[PDB]
Every structure is written in structure tokens, then in C-alpha cells.
Design a binder for this molecule. Structure first.
Ligand code: NI
Ligand code: NI
Ligand code: NI
Ligand code: NI
Ligand code: NI
Ligand code: NI
Ligand code: NI
Ligand code: NI
Ligand code: NI
Ligand code: NI
Ligand code: NI
Ligand code: NI
Lengths: 144, 144, 144, 144, 144, 144
């Protein structure tokens, strides 16, 4: 329910998008909770990318050294955030195209249901039907 | 003058812009100081949107549960920032097209004046003249 | 008046921000009407930049060769747009800090006035006052 | 069906966000098919906005004059695009919270169904439930 | 060489990021030359995404139907651009970690050399060294 | 090695890009470690810009008053981050076009080398060769 997460940030104005795509794959393999890019504008007319890494506070040394080894940045900044997390468990639901795992997130009186992307995309590809069609079929099917 | 604000963030890769526009209206109604979207790029080629909520630190539970109920996110992250705020009071100034309320923000020796958008937009619409024309008329008129 | 303008675009996922600042400076010196960057998202999790150059139709070969020379792109795409341009004339107005050229743009029933950035920024730095202060003083002086 | 659409663009580095919200509201009221903002980066370290307006070819003069009147741009560029449009029909479906219009779009072998945002947002506010709850109920009701 | 390229665009304010990653993967598999996302801002406070697809002029119907099938858009807009393409040839160079193909692009007086990302990323992972290390080694080896 | 940095942020929806470019130049002159813009979307259909300032924690008063004097914002938010910084020293390396200073950043076992943009851009301009060509020549030359 209650948690803390480390946020690590770096401003990269001398890194290519190809190399940035490479480092995001490296950071997820290293176990980061999340990684995202933000387009930013830096001095001297430089379109840059901000790299943000979320992870366990005890992975600070791991994720820092990864960033310092694989990107061009001279330094990183990091800070601890708090987190409020819903409770998760999974349901298998039968849809017109097969079973789809549905994520049931709960927090006190709040309950919502999210079909898992992976199941829906695999069924959309196999039966040559749209992703949104399989996803919406799972939503209807989770009504009971 | 001195203050603190809570920042709540969430990365939404499975939420539509229509639904995001809906939640920003909900968050302002709930009394958030500010809400803004940042376009971000997440794993698996997902163009995502970061939702940032600013508000009173005592509204953490209110704004969290709102986000957890109305968006698709499983968790939120939050942290406390400090704030330095200028002093505000309002002046009514007479322009060629009517009275326009002007915000006078002061901080120590710093003084600046901002015509209120709402008055300027209403007068621009009624008299079928550009917004920037009414706004600039208010700026000239605040010189005395 | 009426015109036609060439638009050249390239999607750059293998370019650093440092190099992009260089090519924009190169292209404006060579006479592009305008150059701008658009953050885009490309394949393989790449935060990329779209380079757009606007310029004279007869300068197509110059600006193309410049992009192919200075960026990593293998190709450029281009198309001609039509343009509608306002008529310009300039007012020099006397302020507390010096003369400021004011651009007066007209189109049919449209008349608008923009103090020139170069004048305002130079006098703000030279007289050690905010930019907004010189900008607003020119507006006041264009009242007559 | 087949169509042609006018695209008008302008790069605005001398416009506030407040004024841009005003002109988008002005242009949609005047009958633009659509208006959107794109964040771009311009010369002299300027975070700018590209304004794009889509509209009827015969409305070119109206939308141009509107942009030249309400923004700071000296010119606009425009070009005509071709369009491929799906065929529309609407289903009104009965939900636990009222009727919801469902847009059924078809193209060759394509059939897709989108609950109308206006219906879902209005019933969610009126019945004090999440938007997603009304949206999903319409999906369930379109199962028949 | 000279070419012409089809550009197809759609403004998506009712699409999730998960679904957008799916359609970009679908469109590249179907033979689009390129697909990219642009963050845009639409009406009713909607953070949206513009989908742009570049492709062969004769593939217009395939890519259109794909977009109409997999996204929520009711229509697409398209136009043909001209293209200027550099001439390509490839150098395979021997590095400390294996062979790396180097793309040598030429145009009039222009000669530039780009190590192939696929080669560099594969050898960096296989030999457990940074990407930059394999990239720079190919540059060194292309010195002869 | 270990450090702390102050982050100051402000959301500007009533500031022009020209004025924002002006303030970024002012903030770097005042000694900020870094300044960047992030495009954001705020309420009432406003494309806005987030201004982020990084600097020494003891420059809080300096950088705040600068922002409050030169922009339109009523308040700033700020927080302290931690930093991990690599060790820096400079090498002059001989390339085919002159000496180029190369930044050698080290952190424990990590060593990487970055040619300084300023030297590479000056040599590219003087000899009328691409930036990337001089930068890559410096990379090859730093191999010994
Ligand atoms: Ni089963
Ligand atoms: Ni009065
Ligand atoms: Ni590439
Ligand atoms: Ni020329
Ligand atoms: Ni001086
Ligand atoms: Ni300007
Ligand atoms: Ni009309
Ligand atoms: Ni009620
Ligand atoms: Ni819609
Ligand atoms: Ni084909
Ligand atoms: Ni291995
Ligand atoms: Ni020397």
C-alpha cells in the first residue's frame, strides 16, 4: 500500500535516439520499475531528451553506474518519492477469442479491471482482428 | 510568502486523451492548485502522458483516490516541494473597452502587473476585436 | 501578398542535440526562411527529432545538400506550400530607454503592432531592466 | 467517402498560451474541422507552438484572416490534403444511467464502435460515477 | 536518386498509448517506410497523438485500411511528397568484437559513414560492453 | 563525487517563447547549472512551457527573484536533489584538422571520452566540413 521509489534523472543533449532506445532496454533489464523519455529544450538551440528512471531506492548504485556507463552524461540527479499503490491480483476471463488475464486493482472501496495488454495483443494477431476489439471484448466479458 | 505544495505524478500509457481531458476537469474541481500533462515516451513504443497534480499537502488522500478511481494507473508517486509566492492584490483599470481587473504581484522590490485573462477575453468577444488587442490596451492603461 | 514556400523535412533518430543546434545555425545562415525542431517518437523506443526547414523554392538544392551533409539522414522529403502574407510597415517609437522599432502588420481590416524583439532585448540588457519593461514602454509609446 | 481538406499552419514564437487557447476556441466556433497545437523548438532558444487548422477548402479566407487577426504571425502557409473517410451510423443504447449514442464506423470489411464521449461524460457527472464506468456499460449494451 | 512518398496522418485523441504501440508495429510489418508519433494538443483539454505514416504511393489503400481498422479515427488525410535520396553502399569492417557493417552515404560532394545500429547493439550485448564502445571501434576500423 | 542541487520549476502559460528564450539566457548568466524547457498542457486549452532551473542550493534567492522579475509567474516551486558526478579532466588530442579538447569523465572503473563541442564546431566551420565529421575524427584520435 505505502511505498517509496527512487527517481533518477539526466538531461542528455549529446546522445542519439538510437542510443537512448538502447539504454532504455538496458535499464528495464536491470530491473527499473519504469523508464521514460521527456523531450526538453536546452541551451544553444539543442533539442534534448530527459531520461527518468524509477526504481527501488536500494538500486541507486546499480542504475546510476548503468547510466554513467551507457550514456554521455557527466552526472545524475536523484531523489526519493513516496508511493501509494493499489492491491493487485489477476483473473482469467473467457472472451469470444480465448482466455484473457485481467488485472483487478483495488484500493479501499475502489475497484477497477484492466485486461492485460499481452494477452489481448497475442489474440488480436492470431485471429487478425483489431487490438481494441479484443480489449473491448475482454472488458465486456469481465462484467461477470 | 513561504509555502509548501504536494506534487502527485502518474505515468499513463493506457488512457485516452479524451479520458485525460475528463480527469483534468475533475482534478481542478477537487481543488488542485494546478494540473498539467507532459508528453512522455514509455517502453514498447508507447506515446504516453504524464499527469502532474499540484495541491495542498493535506489533499494527498483526496487527489490520490481521485486519480486511482478515474484513471487506469495502479499507483501514484508524490513528494513535497517548497514554494515562494508573490503577494497578490487586484486593481480595476479603465481601458478603451471597459474596466479590466489587473493582478499586481509584489515580492520585496519586485512589482509587475498582469491583466486578468477572463476580463480581456470577455471584452474581446463582445466587441469582436483580438484578445491581444484588449490585453495590450489594459497594459497601456495600467501605466497610471 | 502571395507566395509559395518550400518545406523540407527529415526524421532524425541518429542525431545528437548538439549536432542539431549546429545544423539549425548552418541552415539559417544559408538563408532558410525558418528552421524548427519537433519532438517525435520513432521505432525501437527512439526519442527522435523531426527537422523542418522552410525556404525559397529556388534554394531547394542548397538546403537539401546542407541537410544531407550535416545530418545523418539518407533522404529528405519536400513539398511546396502556398502562403498568405500580411503587409508590413515599421514605426520607430521613442521610449525612456531609446528608440524601438514597432512592426505594424495589416491585412484587410486587420491592424496589429508588435515591438521588435531585438530592440527590446538590447535595451533591456543595456539599461539593466526586465524585457517586459521595455516591451510595455514601446506599447505605451505607440499609443501616439 | 472521399474529400479534400485544407491545412493551414503557422509557427508562433511570440504568442502566450492564454492567447493560443483563445484562438483555438475562436477557430472551432468559426467551423474549422479541427485545430491542434504542436510543441516545436525555434531559433534563439524559443519554445514555440505550431498551430495547425484543418478545414473546408472554401473557408480558406475565413480561417486565414482569423489566424492573422488573433495571432502574432505575419503569414500562414496552406496546402490541400486528400481524405479517406469511414461511413458512419449511430446506435443509441440503453445503459443503467441513460441512453448513450454509439458511433459505428465501417470501411470495407472494417466495423468498429465508439461510445460518444459527450454522452459518457455527461452521465458520469450526472450520476456521480467514473467516466470509465459509463463507457464500459455502453460497450456491454452494444453487445446486443 | 529521386522518388515520391505518400504521407498519411491522423489525429488521435481517443487512443491509448498501448494501442498506438500496437498499430506502429502493425504498420511497419506491413511495409510502411516509417511510422512516427507526434505529441499534439487537441480540443477539450486532450493530450493527443498525431500518427504519421510514410510509405509507397501504391500502398495507400493498405496503410489507410490498417489505420482505420486499428485506430479510432473516422478518417485519414494523405498527400504525396517528393524525395531526394543519397546513394548507399556498405562497408563491413573488422572490430575487436566482430564484423560491423558501415553505411557509406554519398551525395554529390558528400560522403558520410554510419555504423549500423543492429551490428553495434548486437555485439555490445553479446560481448557485454557499452554500445558506444562497439560504435567507436567501427569508426576506428573505418579509418582504413 | 557526491553533491546536491536545487531544482526550481515554474509553469508559464502567459509567457511568449521569445520572452522565454530571453529568460533562459538570463538564468545561465546568473550561474544556473542548467536550464531547460518542457512543453506541457495546462487547463483551458493552453499549450504552456515548464521552466526548470538547476543550481547551487545557495542560489535559491538569486534564481527565484530572477524568475519572479523576468517572467509572468506568481510563484516558484523548488526542492533539493542529490547528485552523483563523474570526475572530469581534459585532454588535448591531435586530429586531422587541429587539436580538439576531449573531456575524460571517470567514476570508479568507468571511463569515457567526449570531444568538446566548441572545438569541433569551430573546426567544422573553418574548414567547411560537417560537425559530425570533426567530432568523429576526434573520437578516432582519442583511441591513443
Ligand atoms: Ni481457460
Ligand atoms: Ni468601473
Ligand atoms: Ni539509423
Ligand atoms: Ni536564397
Ligand atoms: Ni550594463
Ligand atoms: Ni517574433
Ligand atoms: Ni464552412
Ligand atoms: Ni450531481
Ligand atoms: Ni473522439
Ligand atoms: Ni509495398
Ligand atoms: Ni552474454
Ligand atoms: Ni597543440
Amino acid at each position: 500500500t505505502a511505498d517509496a521509489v527512487l527517481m533518477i534523472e539526466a538531461n542528455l543533449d549529446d546522445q542519439t535516439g538510437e542510443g537512448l532506445g538502447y539504454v532504455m532496454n538496458q535499464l528495464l533489464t536491470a530491473g527499473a520499475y519504469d523508464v521514460f523519455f521527456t523531450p526538453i529544450q536546452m541551451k544553444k538551440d539543442r533539442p534534448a531528451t530527459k531520461l527518468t528512471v524509477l526504481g527501488n531506492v536500494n538500486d541507486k548504485d546499480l542504475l546510476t553506474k548503468l547510466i554513467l556507463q551507457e550514456t554521455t552524461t557527466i552526472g545524475v540527479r536523484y531523489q526519493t518519492w513516496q508511493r501509494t499503490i493499489m492491491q493487485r491480483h489477476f483473473l482469467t476471463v473467457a472472451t469470444p477469442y480465448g482466455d484473457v488475464q485481467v488485472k483487478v486493482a483495488t484500493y479501499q472501496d475502489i475497484e477497477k479491471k484492466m485486461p492485460e495488454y499481452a494477452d489481448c495483443a497475442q489474440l488480436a494477431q492470431q485471429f487478425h482482428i483489431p487490438f481494441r476489439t479484443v480489449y473491448q471484448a475482454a472488458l465486456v466479458a469481465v462484467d461477470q
